[PDB]
């Protein structure tokens, strides 16, 4: 098996829908965010709700339940937290993880940039390569669901390689033609 990481900004929506999805196909998947903190929407001309990474989903859920039950089920934030609660304890910041993967998948250019940066800014004498891949996906629950499909179809095609390091470039092309998408690709070193 190959260790797959999915990264977005808040580790709340896009990455978790891909986390949930990869896992349910029996994949070795973890998920993070790249933000400073976990920012959640609240009435579009307001200051958003903010929580330090490491905060239980369940508590955030509660913090939102008390604040306005009706408003936050309305925008499906209560359900989305309900769903995350069941996967892992809390949201995790990517630049604080010590785990290692074969493929880190990012869901938008900004996050793709942050991850690549922070990994260049590190270094160590494993010299074991990790492939960072970008697959754009729009930050809404419907578009995230569909993003998990695409993402899980990409991984499913790479978990067939027994020499991923030399096959990947070609499998990204094959895949970009088939899905009519652009997949950015860096190779960083652990």
mmCIF file with all atom_site columns, N, CA, C and O in Angstrom, residues 129-181:
data_model
loop_
_atom_site.group_PDB
_atom_site.id
_atom_site.type_symbol
_atom_site.label_atom_id
_atom_site.label_alt_id
_atom_site.label_comp_id
_atom_site.label_asym_id
_atom_site.label_entity_id
_atom_site.label_seq_id
_atom_site.pdbx_PDB_ins_code
_atom_site.Cartn_x
_atom_site.Cartn_y
_atom_site.Cartn_z
_atom_site.occupancy
_atom_site.B_iso_or_equiv
_atom_site.pdbx_formal_charge
_atom_site.auth_seq_id
_atom_site.auth_comp_id
_atom_site.auth_asym_id
_atom_site.auth_atom_id
_atom_site.pdbx_PDB_model_num
ATOM 1   N N  . UNK A 1 129 ? 11.652  10.072 -1.948  1.00 0.00 ? 129 UNK A N  1
ATOM 2   C CA . UNK A 1 129 ? 10.844  11.033 -2.699  1.00 0.00 ? 129 UNK A CA 1
ATOM 3   C C  . UNK A 1 129 ? 9.376   10.972 -2.317  1.00 0.00 ? 129 UNK A C  1
ATOM 4   O O  . UNK A 1 129 ? 8.849   9.907  -1.978  1.00 0.00 ? 129 UNK A O  1
ATOM 5   N N  . UNK A 1 130 ? 8.724   12.124 -2.370  1.00 0.00 ? 130 UNK A N  1
ATOM 6   C CA . UNK A 1 130 ? 7.283   12.183 -2.235  1.00 0.00 ? 130 UNK A CA 1
ATOM 7   C C  . UNK A 1 130 ? 6.705   13.008 -3.383  1.00 0.00 ? 130 UNK A C  1
ATOM 8   O O  . UNK A 1 130 ? 7.248   14.055 -3.739  1.00 0.00 ? 130 UNK A O  1
ATOM 9   N N  . UNK A 1 131 ? 5.621   12.518 -3.974  1.00 0.00 ? 131 UNK A N  1
ATOM 10  C CA . UNK A 1 131 ? 4.985   13.215 -5.087  1.00 0.00 ? 131 UNK A CA 1
ATOM 11  C C  . UNK A 1 131 ? 3.812   14.095 -4.671  1.00 0.00 ? 131 UNK A C  1
ATOM 12  O O  . UNK A 1 131 ? 2.805   13.614 -4.151  1.00 0.00 ? 131 UNK A O  1
ATOM 13  N N  . UNK A 1 132 ? 3.949   15.391 -4.909  1.00 0.00 ? 132 UNK A N  1
ATOM 14  C CA . UNK A 1 132 ? 2.877   16.326 -4.633  1.00 0.00 ? 132 UNK A CA 1
ATOM 15  C C  . UNK A 1 132 ? 2.106   16.568 -5.921  1.00 0.00 ? 132 UNK A C  1
ATOM 16  O O  . UNK A 1 132 ? 2.696   16.920 -6.935  1.00 0.00 ? 132 UNK A O  1
ATOM 17  N N  . UNK A 1 133 ? 0.795   16.342 -5.865  1.00 0.00 ? 133 UNK A N  1
ATOM 18  C CA . UNK A 1 133 ? -0.105  16.490 -7.013  1.00 0.00 ? 133 UNK A CA 1
ATOM 19  C C  . UNK A 1 133 ? -1.250  17.460 -6.721  1.00 0.00 ? 133 UNK A C  1
ATOM 20  O O  . UNK A 1 133 ? -1.842  17.447 -5.645  1.00 0.00 ? 133 UNK A O  1
ATOM 21  N N  . UNK A 1 134 ? -1.573  18.301 -7.691  1.00 0.00 ? 134 UNK A N  1
ATOM 22  C CA . UNK A 1 134 ? -2.681  19.233 -7.528  1.00 0.00 ? 134 UNK A CA 1
ATOM 23  C C  . UNK A 1 134 ? -3.846  18.829 -8.408  1.00 0.00 ? 134 UNK A C  1
ATOM 24  O O  . UNK A 1 134 ? -3.680  18.565 -9.589  1.00 0.00 ? 134 UNK A O  1
ATOM 25  N N  . UNK A 1 135 ? -5.021  18.746 -7.803  1.00 0.00 ? 135 UNK A N  1
ATOM 26  C CA . UNK A 1 135 ? -6.243  18.487 -8.520  1.00 0.00 ? 135 UNK A CA 1
ATOM 27  C C  . UNK A 1 135 ? -7.216  19.537 -8.008  1.00 0.00 ? 135 UNK A C  1
ATOM 28  O O  . UNK A 1 135 ? -7.712  19.412 -6.891  1.00 0.00 ? 135 UNK A O  1
ATOM 29  N N  . UNK A 1 136 ? -7.459  20.589 -8.796  1.00 0.00 ? 136 UNK A N  1
ATOM 30  C CA . UNK A 1 136 ? -8.372  21.652 -8.374  1.00 0.00 ? 136 UNK A CA 1
ATOM 31  C C  . UNK A 1 136 ? -9.726  21.065 -8.003  1.00 0.00 ? 136 UNK A C  1
ATOM 32  O O  . UNK A 1 136 ? -10.197 20.129 -8.635  1.00 0.00 ? 136 UNK A O  1
ATOM 33  N N  . UNK A 1 137 ? -10.344 21.610 -6.967  1.00 0.00 ? 137 UNK A N  1
ATOM 34  C CA . UNK A 1 137 ? -11.726 21.297 -6.649  1.00 0.00 ? 137 UNK A CA 1
ATOM 35  C C  . UNK A 1 137 ? -12.331 22.478 -5.907  1.00 0.00 ? 137 UNK A C  1
ATOM 36  O O  . UNK A 1 137 ? -11.683 23.064 -5.040  1.00 0.00 ? 137 UNK A O  1
ATOM 37  N N  . UNK A 1 138 ? -13.562 22.834 -6.266  1.00 0.00 ? 138 UNK A N  1
ATOM 38  C CA . UNK A 1 138 ? -14.208 24.017 -5.719  1.00 0.00 ? 138 UNK A CA 1
ATOM 39  C C  . UNK A 1 138 ? -14.728 23.774 -4.311  1.00 0.00 ? 138 UNK A C  1
ATOM 40  O O  . UNK A 1 138 ? -15.287 22.726 -4.027  1.00 0.00 ? 138 UNK A O  1
ATOM 41  N N  . UNK A 1 139 ? -14.541 24.755 -3.435  1.00 0.00 ? 139 UNK A N  1
ATOM 42  C CA . UNK A 1 139 ? -14.853 24.589 -2.023  1.00 0.00 ? 139 UNK A CA 1
ATOM 43  C C  . UNK A 1 139 ? -16.343 24.662 -1.665  1.00 0.00 ? 139 UNK A C  1
ATOM 44  O O  . UNK A 1 139 ? -16.767 25.507 -0.880  1.00 0.00 ? 139 UNK A O  1
ATOM 45  N N  . UNK A 1 140 ? -17.136 23.758 -2.227  1.00 0.00 ? 140 UNK A N  1
ATOM 46  C CA . UNK A 1 140 ? -18.500 23.547 -1.758  1.00 0.00 ? 140 UNK A CA 1
ATOM 47  C C  . UNK A 1 140 ? -18.774 22.052 -1.593  1.00 0.00 ? 140 UNK A C  1
ATOM 48  O O  . UNK A 1 140 ? -18.083 21.224 -2.181  1.00 0.00 ? 140 UNK A O  1
ATOM 49  N N  . UNK A 1 141 ? -19.758 21.700 -0.774  1.00 0.00 ? 141 UNK A N  1
ATOM 50  C CA . UNK A 1 141 ? -19.982 20.295 -0.451  1.00 0.00 ? 141 UNK A CA 1
ATOM 51  C C  . UNK A 1 141 ? -20.296 19.425 -1.665  1.00 0.00 ? 141 UNK A C  1
ATOM 52  O O  . UNK A 1 141 ? -19.926 18.253 -1.690  1.00 0.00 ? 141 UNK A O  1
ATOM 53  N N  . UNK A 1 142 ? -20.975 19.987 -2.662  1.00 0.00 ? 142 UNK A N  1
ATOM 54  C CA . UNK A 1 142 ? -21.322 19.239 -3.870  1.00 0.00 ? 142 UNK A CA 1
ATOM 55  C C  . UNK A 1 142 ? -20.101 19.040 -4.740  1.00 0.00 ? 142 UNK A C  1
ATOM 56  O O  . UNK A 1 142 ? -19.874 17.969 -5.284  1.00 0.00 ? 142 UNK A O  1
ATOM 57  N N  . UNK A 1 143 ? -19.313 20.091 -4.873  1.00 0.00 ? 143 UNK A N  1
ATOM 58  C CA . UNK A 1 143 ? -18.152 20.050 -5.736  1.00 0.00 ? 143 UNK A CA 1
ATOM 59  C C  . UNK A 1 143 ? -17.040 19.228 -5.112  1.00 0.00 ? 143 UNK A C  1
ATOM 60  O O  . UNK A 1 143 ? -16.235 18.646 -5.828  1.00 0.00 ? 143 UNK A O  1
ATOM 61  N N  . UNK A 1 144 ? -17.011 19.193 -3.777  1.00 0.00 ? 144 UNK A N  1
ATOM 62  C CA . UNK A 1 144 ? -16.050 18.405 -3.000  1.00 0.00 ? 144 UNK A CA 1
ATOM 63  C C  . UNK A 1 144 ? -16.325 16.925 -3.167  1.00 0.00 ? 144 UNK A C  1
ATOM 64  O O  . UNK A 1 144 ? -15.420 16.142 -3.447  1.00 0.00 ? 144 UNK A O  1
ATOM 65  N N  . UNK A 1 145 ? -17.585 16.550 -2.995  1.00 0.00 ? 145 UNK A N  1
ATOM 66  C CA . UNK A 1 145 ? -18.014 15.193 -3.273  1.00 0.00 ? 145 UNK A CA 1
ATOM 67  C C  . UNK A 1 145 ? -17.491 14.753 -4.630  1.00 0.00 ? 145 UNK A C  1
ATOM 68  O O  . UNK A 1 145 ? -16.860 13.717 -4.746  1.00 0.00 ? 145 UNK A O  1
ATOM 69  N N  . UNK A 1 146 ? -17.732 15.547 -5.661  1.00 0.00 ? 146 UNK A N  1
ATOM 70  C CA . UNK A 1 146 ? -17.273 15.172 -6.987  1.00 0.00 ? 146 UNK A CA 1
ATOM 71  C C  . UNK A 1 146 ? -15.741 15.162 -7.076  1.00 0.00 ? 146 UNK A C  1
ATOM 72  O O  . UNK A 1 146 ? -15.163 14.365 -7.805  1.00 0.00 ? 146 UNK A O  1
ATOM 73  N N  . UNK A 1 147 ? -15.085 16.038 -6.326  1.00 0.00 ? 147 UNK A N  1
ATOM 74  C CA . UNK A 1 147 ? -13.636 16.060 -6.294  1.00 0.00 ? 147 UNK A CA 1
ATOM 75  C C  . UNK A 1 147 ? -13.088 14.752 -5.746  1.00 0.00 ? 147 UNK A C  1
ATOM 76  O O  . UNK A 1 147 ? -12.080 14.237 -6.226  1.00 0.00 ? 147 UNK A O  1
ATOM 77  N N  . UNK A 1 148 ? -13.748 14.197 -4.737  1.00 0.00 ? 148 UNK A N  1
ATOM 78  C CA . UNK A 1 148 ? -13.284 12.940 -4.174  1.00 0.00 ? 148 UNK A CA 1
ATOM 79  C C  . UNK A 1 148 ? -13.280 11.857 -5.243  1.00 0.00 ? 148 UNK A C  1
ATOM 80  O O  . UNK A 1 148 ? -12.362 11.045 -5.293  1.00 0.00 ? 148 UNK A O  1
ATOM 81  N N  . UNK A 1 149 ? -14.289 11.848 -6.108  1.00 0.00 ? 149 UNK A N  1
ATOM 82  C CA . UNK A 1 149 ? -14.339 10.869 -7.192  1.00 0.00 ? 149 UNK A CA 1
ATOM 83  C C  . UNK A 1 149 ? -13.095 10.919 -8.055  1.00 0.00 ? 149 UNK A C  1
ATOM 84  O O  . UNK A 1 149 ? -12.406 9.921  -8.232  1.00 0.00 ? 149 UNK A O  1
ATOM 85  N N  . UNK A 1 150 ? -12.833 12.095 -8.604  1.00 0.00 ? 150 UNK A N  1
ATOM 86  C CA . UNK A 1 150 ? -11.693 12.317 -9.467  1.00 0.00 ? 150 UNK A CA 1
ATOM 87  C C  . UNK A 1 150 ? -10.413 11.915 -8.738  1.00 0.00 ? 150 UNK A C  1
ATOM 88  O O  . UNK A 1 150 ? -9.659  11.084 -9.225  1.00 0.00 ? 150 UNK A O  1
ATOM 89  N N  . UNK A 1 151 ? -10.180 12.506 -7.569  1.00 0.00 ? 151 UNK A N  1
ATOM 90  C CA . UNK A 1 151 ? -9.026  12.165 -6.743  1.00 0.00 ? 151 UNK A CA 1
ATOM 91  C C  . UNK A 1 151 ? -8.896  10.656 -6.504  1.00 0.00 ? 151 UNK A C  1
ATOM 92  O O  . UNK A 1 151 ? -7.825  10.092 -6.711  1.00 0.00 ? 151 UNK A O  1
ATOM 93  N N  . UNK A 1 152 ? -9.971  9.997  -6.083  1.00 0.00 ? 152 UNK A N  1
ATOM 94  C CA . UNK A 1 152 ? -9.913  8.554  -5.842  1.00 0.00 ? 152 UNK A CA 1
ATOM 95  C C  . UNK A 1 152 ? -9.701  7.723  -7.107  1.00 0.00 ? 152 UNK A C  1
ATOM 96  O O  . UNK A 1 152 ? -9.346  6.551  -7.038  1.00 0.00 ? 152 UNK A O  1
ATOM 97  N N  . UNK A 1 153 ? -9.935  8.317  -8.262  1.00 0.00 ? 153 UNK A N  1
ATOM 98  C CA . UNK A 1 153 ? -9.769  7.595  -9.508  1.00 0.00 ? 153 UNK A CA 1
ATOM 99  C C  . UNK A 1 153 ? -8.311  7.705  -9.924  1.00 0.00 ? 153 UNK A C  1
ATOM 100 O O  . UNK A 1 153 ? -7.748  6.792  -10.526 1.00 0.00 ? 153 UNK A O  1
ATOM 101 N N  . UNK A 1 154 ? -7.705  8.836  -9.583  1.00 0.00 ? 154 UNK A N  1
ATOM 102 C CA . UNK A 1 154 ? -6.294  9.070  -9.842  1.00 0.00 ? 154 UNK A CA 1
ATOM 103 C C  . UNK A 1 154 ? -5.430  8.132  -9.019  1.00 0.00 ? 154 UNK A C  1
ATOM 104 O O  . UNK A 1 154 ? -4.537  7.480  -9.548  1.00 0.00 ? 154 UNK A O  1
ATOM 105 N N  . UNK A 1 155 ? -5.691  8.075  -7.718  1.00 0.00 ? 155 UNK A N  1
ATOM 106 C CA . UNK A 1 155 ? -4.916  7.232  -6.820  1.00 0.00 ? 155 UNK A CA 1
ATOM 107 C C  . UNK A 1 155 ? -5.077  5.771  -7.222  1.00 0.00 ? 155 UNK A C  1
ATOM 108 O O  . UNK A 1 155 ? -4.104  5.051  -7.380  1.00 0.00 ? 155 UNK A O  1
ATOM 109 N N  . UNK A 1 156 ? -6.318  5.352  -7.417  1.00 0.00 ? 156 UNK A N  1
ATOM 110 C CA . UNK A 1 156 ? -6.610  3.995  -7.860  1.00 0.00 ? 156 UNK A CA 1
ATOM 111 C C  . UNK A 1 156 ? -5.794  3.560  -9.074  1.00 0.00 ? 156 UNK A C  1
ATOM 112 O O  . UNK A 1 156 ? -5.588  2.373  -9.311  1.00 0.00 ? 156 UNK A O  1
ATOM 113 N N  . UNK A 1 157 ? -5.343  4.528  -9.855  1.00 0.00 ? 157 UNK A N  1
ATOM 114 C CA . UNK A 1 157 ? -4.595  4.235  -11.068 1.00 0.00 ? 157 UNK A CA 1
ATOM 115 C C  . UNK A 1 157 ? -3.097  4.216  -10.795 1.00 0.00 ? 157 UNK A C  1
ATOM 116 O O  . UNK A 1 157 ? -2.322  3.685  -11.585 1.00 0.00 ? 157 UNK A O  1
ATOM 117 N N  . UNK A 1 158 ? -2.689  4.794  -9.674  1.00 0.00 ? 158 UNK A N  1
ATOM 118 C CA . UNK A 1 158 ? -1.278  4.853  -9.339  1.00 0.00 ? 158 UNK A CA 1
ATOM 119 C C  . UNK A 1 158 ? -0.890  3.743  -8.389  1.00 0.00 ? 158 UNK A C  1
ATOM 120 O O  . UNK A 1 158 ? 0.276   3.355  -8.310  1.00 0.00 ? 158 UNK A O  1
ATOM 121 N N  . UNK A 1 159 ? -1.879  3.231  -7.672  1.00 0.00 ? 159 UNK A N  1
ATOM 122 C CA . UNK A 1 159 ? -1.664  2.133  -6.761  1.00 0.00 ? 159 UNK A CA 1
ATOM 123 C C  . UNK A 1 159 ? -1.485  0.844  -7.555  1.00 0.00 ? 159 UNK A C  1
ATOM 124 O O  . UNK A 1 159 ? -1.460  -0.240 -6.983  1.00 0.00 ? 159 UNK A O  1
ATOM 125 N N  . UNK A 1 160 ? -1.372  0.961  -8.874  1.00 0.00 ? 160 UNK A N  1
ATOM 126 C CA . UNK A 1 160 ? -1.166  -0.206 -9.720  1.00 0.00 ? 160 UNK A CA 1
ATOM 127 C C  . UNK A 1 160 ? 0.291   -0.294 -10.127 1.00 0.00 ? 160 UNK A C  1
ATOM 128 O O  . UNK A 1 160 ? 0.752   -1.319 -10.625 1.00 0.00 ? 160 UNK A O  1
ATOM 129 N N  . UNK A 1 161 ? 1.021   0.787  -9.905  1.00 0.00 ? 161 UNK A N  1
ATOM 130 C CA . UNK A 1 161 ? 2.424   0.813  -10.265 1.00 0.00 ? 161 UNK A CA 1
ATOM 131 C C  . UNK A 1 161 ? 3.253   0.054  -9.236  1.00 0.00 ? 161 UNK A C  1
ATOM 132 O O  . UNK A 1 161 ? 2.936   0.057  -8.047  1.00 0.00 ? 161 UNK A O  1
ATOM 133 N N  . UNK A 1 162 ? 4.308   -0.608 -9.696  1.00 0.00 ? 162 UNK A N  1
ATOM 134 C CA . UNK A 1 162 ? 5.265   -1.242 -8.793  1.00 0.00 ? 162 UNK A CA 1
ATOM 135 C C  . UNK A 1 162 ? 6.615   -0.590 -9.007  1.00 0.00 ? 162 UNK A C  1
ATOM 136 O O  . UNK A 1 162 ? 7.659   -1.218 -8.841  1.00 0.00 ? 162 UNK A O  1
ATOM 137 N N  . UNK A 1 163 ? 6.569   0.680  -9.389  1.00 0.00 ? 163 UNK A N  1
ATOM 138 C CA . UNK A 1 163 ? 7.744   1.481  -9.669  1.00 0.00 ? 163 UNK A CA 1
ATOM 139 C C  . UNK A 1 163 ? 7.240   2.901  -9.907  1.00 0.00 ? 163 UNK A C  1
ATOM 140 O O  . UNK A 1 163 ? 7.621   3.583  -10.861 1.00 0.00 ? 163 UNK A O  1
ATOM 141 N N  . UNK A 1 164 ? 6.356   3.316  -9.007  1.00 0.00 ? 164 UNK A N  1
ATOM 142 C CA . UNK A 1 164 ? 5.675   4.598  -9.058  1.00 0.00 ? 164 UNK A CA 1
ATOM 143 C C  . UNK A 1 164 ? 6.574   5.754  -9.474  1.00 0.00 ? 164 UNK A C  1
ATOM 144 O O  . UNK A 1 164 ? 6.130   6.669  -10.161 1.00 0.00 ? 164 UNK A O  1
ATOM 145 N N  . UNK A 1 165 ? 7.830   5.718  -9.054  1.00 0.00 ? 165 UNK A N  1
ATOM 146 C CA . UNK A 1 165 ? 8.757   6.812  -9.318  1.00 0.00 ? 165 UNK A CA 1
ATOM 147 C C  . UNK A 1 165 ? 9.015   7.036  -10.803 1.00 0.00 ? 165 UNK A C  1
ATOM 148 O O  . UNK A 1 165 ? 9.256   8.164  -11.237 1.00 0.00 ? 165 UNK A O  1
ATOM 149 N N  . UNK A 1 166 ? 8.968   5.955  -11.574 1.00 0.00 ? 166 UNK A N  1
ATOM 150 C CA . UNK A 1 166 ? 9.268   6.015  -13.000 1.00 0.00 ? 166 UNK A CA 1
ATOM 151 C C  . UNK A 1 166 ? 8.033   5.912  -13.886 1.00 0.00 ? 166 UNK A C  1
ATOM 152 O O  . UNK A 1 166 ? 8.117   6.099  -15.098 1.00 0.00 ? 166 UNK A O  1
ATOM 153 N N  . UNK A 1 167 ? 6.889   5.610  -13.280 1.00 0.00 ? 167 UNK A N  1
ATOM 154 C CA . UNK A 1 167 ? 5.636   5.488  -14.018 1.00 0.00 ? 167 UNK A CA 1
ATOM 155 C C  . UNK A 1 167 ? 4.760   6.716  -13.863 1.00 0.00 ? 167 UNK A C  1
ATOM 156 O O  . UNK A 1 167 ? 3.856   6.941  -14.664 1.00 0.00 ? 167 UNK A O  1
ATOM 157 N N  . UNK A 1 168 ? 5.000   7.503  -12.824 1.00 0.00 ? 168 UNK A N  1
ATOM 158 C CA . UNK A 1 168 ? 4.019   8.516  -12.466 1.00 0.00 ? 168 UNK A CA 1
ATOM 159 C C  . UNK A 1 168 ? 3.820   9.545  -13.570 1.00 0.00 ? 168 UNK A C  1
ATOM 160 O O  . UNK A 1 168 ? 2.700   9.803  -13.984 1.00 0.00 ? 168 UNK A O  1
ATOM 161 N N  . UNK A 1 169 ? 4.911   10.105 -14.067 1.00 0.00 ? 169 UNK A N  1
ATOM 162 C CA . UNK A 1 169 ? 4.830   11.144 -15.087 1.00 0.00 ? 169 UNK A CA 1
ATOM 163 C C  . UNK A 1 169 ? 3.898   10.747 -16.217 1.00 0.00 ? 169 UNK A C  1
ATOM 164 O O  . UNK A 1 169 ? 3.098   11.554 -16.695 1.00 0.00 ? 169 UNK A O  1
ATOM 165 N N  . UNK A 1 170 ? 4.009   9.496  -16.643 1.00 0.00 ? 170 UNK A N  1
ATOM 166 C CA . UNK A 1 170 ? 3.252   9.027  -17.783 1.00 0.00 ? 170 UNK A CA 1
ATOM 167 C C  . UNK A 1 170 ? 1.794   8.774  -17.410 1.00 0.00 ? 170 UNK A C  1
ATOM 168 O O  . UNK A 1 170 ? 0.901   8.921  -18.238 1.00 0.00 ? 170 UNK A O  1
ATOM 169 N N  . UNK A 1 171 ? 1.555   8.410  -16.161 1.00 0.00 ? 171 UNK A N  1
ATOM 170 C CA . UNK A 1 171 ? 0.201   8.131  -15.713 1.00 0.00 ? 171 UNK A CA 1
ATOM 171 C C  . UNK A 1 171 ? -0.565  9.417  -15.436 1.00 0.00 ? 171 UNK A C  1
ATOM 172 O O  . UNK A 1 171 ? -1.793  9.424  -15.374 1.00 0.00 ? 171 UNK A O  1
ATOM 173 N N  . UNK A 1 172 ? 0.163   10.510 -15.261 1.00 0.00 ? 172 UNK A N  1
ATOM 174 C CA . UNK A 1 172 ? -0.462  11.808 -15.060 1.00 0.00 ? 172 UNK A CA 1
ATOM 175 C C  . UNK A 1 172 ? -0.927  12.344 -16.404 1.00 0.00 ? 172 UNK A C  1
ATOM 176 O O  . UNK A 1 172 ? -2.002  12.928 -16.514 1.00 0.00 ? 172 UNK A O  1
ATOM 177 N N  . UNK A 1 173 ? -0.121  12.130 -17.435 1.00 0.00 ? 173 UNK A N  1
ATOM 178 C CA . UNK A 1 173 ? -0.543  12.469 -18.783 1.00 0.00 ? 173 UNK A CA 1
ATOM 179 C C  . UNK A 1 173 ? -1.801  11.686 -19.158 1.00 0.00 ? 173 UNK A C  1
ATOM 180 O O  . UNK A 1 173 ? -2.863  12.276 -19.337 1.00 0.00 ? 173 UNK A O  1
ATOM 181 N N  . UNK A 1 174 ? -1.679  10.365 -19.268 1.00 0.00 ? 174 UNK A N  1
ATOM 182 C CA . UNK A 1 174 ? -2.832  9.502  -19.486 1.00 0.00 ? 174 UNK A CA 1
ATOM 183 C C  . UNK A 1 174 ? -4.081  10.021 -18.794 1.00 0.00 ? 174 UNK A C  1
ATOM 184 O O  . UNK A 1 174 ? -5.163  10.060 -19.381 1.00 0.00 ? 174 UNK A O  1
ATOM 185 N N  . UNK A 1 175 ? -3.922  10.408 -17.537 1.00 0.00 ? 175 UNK A N  1
ATOM 186 C CA . UNK A 1 175 ? -5.045  10.820 -16.709 1.00 0.00 ? 175 UNK A CA 1
ATOM 187 C C  . UNK A 1 175 ? -5.570  12.215 -17.077 1.00 0.00 ? 175 UNK A C  1
ATOM 188 O O  . UNK A 1 175 ? -6.769  12.459 -17.047 1.00 0.00 ? 175 UNK A O  1
ATOM 189 N N  . UNK A 1 176 ? -4.670  13.125 -17.431 1.00 0.00 ? 176 UNK A N  1
ATOM 190 C CA . UNK A 1 176 ? -5.072  14.473 -17.821 1.00 0.00 ? 176 UNK A CA 1
ATOM 191 C C  . UNK A 1 176 ? -5.852  14.468 -19.133 1.00 0.00 ? 176 UNK A C  1
ATOM 192 O O  . UNK A 1 176 ? -6.775  15.262 -19.306 1.00 0.00 ? 176 UNK A O  1
ATOM 193 N N  . UNK A 1 177 ? -5.476  13.577 -20.049 1.00 0.00 ? 177 UNK A N  1
ATOM 194 C CA . UNK A 1 177 ? -6.220  13.400 -21.293 1.00 0.00 ? 177 UNK A CA 1
ATOM 195 C C  . UNK A 1 177 ? -7.594  12.826 -20.993 1.00 0.00 ? 177 UNK A C  1
ATOM 196 O O  . UNK A 1 177 ? -8.601  13.283 -21.509 1.00 0.00 ? 177 UNK A O  1
ATOM 197 N N  . UNK A 1 178 ? -7.640  11.823 -20.137 1.00 0.00 ? 178 UNK A N  1
ATOM 198 C CA . UNK A 1 178 ? -8.894  11.143 -19.907 1.00 0.00 ? 178 UNK A CA 1
ATOM 199 C C  . UNK A 1 178 ? -9.901  12.029 -19.177 1.00 0.00 ? 178 UNK A C  1
ATOM 200 O O  . UNK A 1 178 ? -11.081 12.022 -19.507 1.00 0.00 ? 178 UNK A O  1
ATOM 201 N N  . UNK A 1 179 ? -9.434  12.791 -18.195 1.00 0.00 ? 179 UNK A N  1
ATOM 202 C CA . UNK A 1 179 ? -10.329 13.566 -17.332 1.00 0.00 ? 179 UNK A CA 1
ATOM 203 C C  . UNK A 1 179 ? -10.366 15.043 -17.715 1.00 0.00 ? 179 UNK A C  1
ATOM 204 O O  . UNK A 1 179 ? -11.081 15.836 -17.099 1.00 0.00 ? 179 UNK A O  1
ATOM 205 N N  . UNK A 1 180 ? -9.592  15.403 -18.735 1.00 0.00 ? 180 UNK A N  1
ATOM 206 C CA . UNK A 1 180 ? -9.571  16.770 -19.264 1.00 0.00 ? 180 UNK A CA 1
ATOM 207 C C  . UNK A 1 180 ? -9.277  17.803 -18.187 1.00 0.00 ? 180 UNK A C  1
ATOM 208 O O  . UNK A 1 180 ? -9.857  18.890 -18.173 1.00 0.00 ? 180 UNK A O  1
ATOM 209 N N  . UNK A 1 181 ? -8.358  17.444 -17.299 1.00 0.00 ? 181 UNK A N  1
ATOM 210 C CA . UNK A 1 181 ? -7.948  18.288 -16.184 1.00 0.00 ? 181 UNK A CA 1
ATOM 211 C C  . UNK A 1 181 ? -6.454  18.511 -16.248 1.00 0.00 ? 181 UNK A C  1
ATOM 212 O O  . UNK A 1 181 ? -5.734  17.757 -16.899 1.00 0.00 ? 181 UNK A O  1
#
